[PDB]
Structure 1
Amino acid sequence: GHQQLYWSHPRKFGQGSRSCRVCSNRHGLIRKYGLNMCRQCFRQYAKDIGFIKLD
């Protein structure tokens, strides 16, 4: 049926399973320290998180 083909592909791995938590896109994801967000929004919200370019 349609219920057995709509969301039956395995999403246990890969970059298509995870996404950004702002853009929900699947490119340039920062998975380090559980950020799980793209580098553009990381540059956007690094001041709000606490990251700062000291050196």
Structure 2
Amino acid sequence: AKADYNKRKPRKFGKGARRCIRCGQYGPIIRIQGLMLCRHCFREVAPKLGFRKYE
């Protein structure tokens, strides 16, 4: 039983090369300024990250 298996192969592009640092998701990743945050995480987080809803 070798360990060569069970390992994610290197990936440089596609949906499999980006994950939410806080959630680990694979879908709606925000890369606007290198946030690398999922949509839901960013929504729940914006007020305290310095972002504001002025209007």
Same topology, TM > 0.5: yes
When the two chains are superposed, the root-mean-square deviation of aligned CA atoms in Å is 1.8
Matches within 5 A, 1:19-38: 19-38=19-38
Matches within 5 A, 1:14-53: 14-53=14-53
Secondary structure class of the residue paired with 1:19: coil
* d(CA) in 2 for partners of 1:5, 1:11: 16
**1:13 matched to which residue of 2?**
13
Structure 2 residues without counterparts, runs of 5 or longer = none
Structure 1 residues without counterparts, runs of 5 or longer = none
Identity of matched residues, %: 41
Q: TM-score, with normalisation over the residues of structure 2?
A: 0.79
* d(CA) in 1 for partners of 2:8, 2:45: 35
Q: TM-score, with normalisation over the residues of structure 1?
A: 0.79
